[PDB]
Amino acid sequence: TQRLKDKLAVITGGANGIGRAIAERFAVEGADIAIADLVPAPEAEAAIRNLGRRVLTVKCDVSQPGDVEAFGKQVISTFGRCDILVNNAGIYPLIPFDELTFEQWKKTFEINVDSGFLMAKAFVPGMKRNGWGRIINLTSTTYWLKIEAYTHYISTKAANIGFTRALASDLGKDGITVNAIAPSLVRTATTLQAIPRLQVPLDLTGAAAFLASDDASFITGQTLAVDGGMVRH
Amino acid sequence: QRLKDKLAVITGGANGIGRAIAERFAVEGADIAIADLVPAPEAEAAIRNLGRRVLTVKCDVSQPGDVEAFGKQVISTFGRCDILVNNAGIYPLIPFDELTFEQWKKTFEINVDSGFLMAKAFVPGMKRNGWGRIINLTSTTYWLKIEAYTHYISTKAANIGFTRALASDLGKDGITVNAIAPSLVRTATTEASALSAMFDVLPNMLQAIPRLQVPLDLTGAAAFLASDDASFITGQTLAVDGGMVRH
Amino acid sequence: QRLKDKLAVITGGANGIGRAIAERFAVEGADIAIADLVPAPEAEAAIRNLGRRVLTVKCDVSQPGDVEAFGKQVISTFGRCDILVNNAGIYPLIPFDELTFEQWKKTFEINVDSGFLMAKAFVPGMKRNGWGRIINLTSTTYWLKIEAYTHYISTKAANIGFTRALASDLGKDGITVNAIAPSLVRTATTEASALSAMFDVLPNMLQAIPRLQVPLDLTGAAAFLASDDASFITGQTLAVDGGMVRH
Amino acid sequence: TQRLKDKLAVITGGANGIGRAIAERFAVEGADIAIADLVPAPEAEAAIRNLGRRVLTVKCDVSQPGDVEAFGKQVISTFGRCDILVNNAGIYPLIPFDELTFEQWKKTFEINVDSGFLMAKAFVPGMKRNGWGRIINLTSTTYWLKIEAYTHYISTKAANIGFTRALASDLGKDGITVNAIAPSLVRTATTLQAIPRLQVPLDLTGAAAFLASDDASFITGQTLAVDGGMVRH
Ligand SMILES: NC(=O)c1ccc[n+]([C@@H]2O[C@H](COP(=O)([O-])OP(=O)(O)OC[C@H]3O[C@@H](n4cnc5c(N)ncnc54)[C@H](O)[C@@H]3O)[C@@H](O)[C@H]2O)c1
Ligand SMILES: NC(=O)c1ccc[n+]([C@@H]2O[C@H](COP(=O)([O-])OP(=O)(O)OC[C@H]3O[C@@H](n4cnc5c(N)ncnc54)[C@H](O)[C@@H]3O)[C@@H](O)[C@H]2O)c1
Ligand SMILES: NC(=O)c1ccc[n+]([C@@H]2O[C@H](COP(=O)([O-])OP(=O)(O)OC[C@H]3O[C@@H](n4cnc5c(N)ncnc54)[C@H](O)[C@@H]3O)[C@@H](O)[C@H]2O)c1
């Protein structure tokens, strides 16, 4: 059953890892894709074409207002709408606090947190006109774990949750849901549990597709931990 | 048919949420075994009318003897249980100064012992076959300020503790254990309860989504957790309440 | 003497955490009434040697009769209870496949019924006087993946649910209800338990503070919650575990 | 009993509301104060003098690296140390999402989140040398509540918690604790519960003094809700 048929889904950071897996899972579900990423998405486009869906890929720095505004327009001209926004772009370099500079700290927020805002500002207007929308933000289980050298990272991942919860309250009456997913230590090309096994991008796709469907229209402001039963909240 | 060729047990499945979940599981290709104090004529028909098989048993899920008898009747009728939904539970309003040890204890027998007893009877089969699903119904009142429910809320919290611990115990057995926390849902019991007053307050006031919740709002989440798309999700509590609580 | 002229009841106060909390409350000017299965000779002496009065009773906090008798002995000796610390509780390791309904049930009687029974006996006096403190001991295992504890963790979660609900019921009565969640603490029982193995692992591995926890690490938090500096804090669970869990 | 005797406590936004109440409660406890705020702190200094403690007040925009670095130095020259840092500065203007501009969003982060970082970078070095420290961050119960027009605000309050948790992990081995306090709807000069009563600044002082003392040396990475029993987490 294609639960996302005729839906247009935007996925930042969709060129690799979790972003790609989600973009592809959505195409399988029947949705068209619009990818925003710093580097080309050859593998993604190809994968999405073979499914019979439309795909748009754009080299865009989601931390720059200009880029996002441009990307927003190019997406509306191309598909005329965005029903689903998946904020997946983010960086997680390990950096000891004594080495963490204000520049690195600010840089981590611009990419991990600002992007979600700028993208929301670009696509929420359309979602409201159509009276339907789905915003999914990627956070991290590290938010609840004891781990060093991630002061910058964990701070942005928590903002992601606050943003998910607060924006949920602002759009609840427009038929738009705002939720978040917190994966564990996933195995991507650049990357204690109840279920003994390393996590892979595919593990997150089921939750993403569920949240973006009608089966979760009454679920908003939540954070779903998909980590094999490590974190409990 | 994400649940084709599977057998699911649903306690308290005659009405409201339990019944709605039973019906949705059938639609997804699953046979049903309902355990309940009252008859489930409307549930059965709907399920049979969906082309699936159903078994309804008058059982007090709080009693070891009844659950055991129920377990046997299920095995010799369908064979083995793949999905267990612990939905049975009561929630009468009682002031702490009035709450007697007897009421306190009885609320635990129905709301907590039922889940344990039910898991003891069906986990062995799930384990021997390397696959299973256990879904526990809890309440958003766990994170809310509301009086006259120290007994109810203590059991709902236990439900969550039970969810988290059993998940750890069954993690290596292809079995996941999760919980669903609904808001104030519209059902025959609540409609005829003292909660009926909030039916118009809480929704368009403390919820992000200004709409009273109905059984069908929960079925999506249950179907999801009971499927392969959620095989790496265990020990979690999913609040389906229109955005009221945030945890 | 933040607790001068006050009477505090401490269940399971003969050893470990309970005893340490009893001793600290005395230092702050409070008299003590200990309820426990075993004798508390070391606790009494320490307390008497601090210039305060103490009462120790051999009582099974899980039994309604015993708690009632204990309640009366406390009233005719000290008068009225101002602070209640529900610290009694067991935590044997048991695999779910071995866990019998009898063990399950007995773990709830000792870990959960005790708190309820104890509150029933002392809340009335706290209410009539417009002031009181109820502190419940729970566990950080509530947020951790650990096997063979579905019974223990379900009761610990109930402890929290009990904390939250009673707080709502007693909010307007000058009484606050809170809980403390310790990490793996060093005590005679744990030292002679299967947990003794983690004594060197968990601390300098899963904790922010690389140090094994000892009873005195918890006393500060208890004294705080039992005082006026915490009169506007109720229904909360305070984890004192060196920064392991975050909730 | 003066549990903070001979301790030097820095309190951002200490000119009014919660900041002031905490600064004064700390002085009662025996600590010296160093206040950082946009406006003068006449009432505060006066209040702190009368207790017999030392006090330093400085007009400083805690969102500007330059100001914080200067403030940091002026504090070390004056007292030679900072044992306690209380990140209390923050703004909470209600702003509907459709009206929220990228400028307002960025501005809210610079004041509510950046400040805590810059201040930590300035005083953690000293705390580590002395092998003792206490960092307390002010967050908000709104983080767990359904309320509109606070997407910017709630997002920063959540980052405050992530920062509290992550920094706790980085400094745990240096004898430094990092905790947070989440008040309810407090009644300040510019500002559903189990305990029926409006909250006042004084309600938070007890928790702050507790956290900054030896009685909480084993408590780190936590968030304490002081709201009269509304929120449960
Ligand atoms: N990998 C993990 O173990 C893990 C754990 C927890 C949470 N997460 C979260 O998941 C997301 C990352 O997923 P991933 O692991 O698959 O990463 P990844 O390896 O796929 O890399 C991130 C992707 O985002 C892109 N990207 C980075 N900055 C960008 C920018 N400014 N503009 C546009 N695109 C940009 C990259 O080009 C890349 O395609 C982040 O939000 C991260 O916080 C990951
Ligand atoms: N309805 C709500 O708004 C709401 C909110 C939060 C949580 N819950 C939880 O959901 C569950 C109930 O949902 P509902 O209200 O839709 O159901 P419902 O209205 O159909 O009533 C509960 C059902 O449980 C059955 N039951 C009670 N005790 C039983 C026993 N000993 N043996 C077998 N069956 C028994 C009843 O016969 C009935 O069919 C409970 O676990 C409750 O704690 C409900
Ligand atoms: N020790 C830990 O590492 C740890 C961790 C998390 C939670 N806890 C909780 O803390 C409490 C115990 O702390 P502790 O280990 O320092 O205490 P402890 O080592 O002194 O042992 C428990 C005490 O409880 C008493 N007790 C048990 N059942 C009783 C009954 N029926 N009536 C009266 N007394 C009874 C025992 O006699 C004993 O004095 C329990 O509630 C437990 O769940 C302990």
Ligand SMILES: NC(=O)c1ccc[n+]([C@@H]2O[C@H](COP(=O)([O-])OP(=O)(O)OC[C@H]3O[C@@H](n4cnc5c(N)ncnc54)[C@H](O)[C@@H]3O)[C@@H](O)[C@H]2O)c1
């Ligand atoms: N007031 C509430 O109901 C409430 C509720 C939840 C959380 N909080 C939090 O508490 C803190 C505010 O406390 P308050 O209510 O007493 O506020 P307040 O009325 O005292 O005002 C904030 C103080 O911070 C100062 N300030 C603002 N920007 C500054 C800057 N850039 N540099 C230096 N100082 C600056 C102001 O001059 C003022 O003294 C914030 O962190 C806020 O998020 C407040």
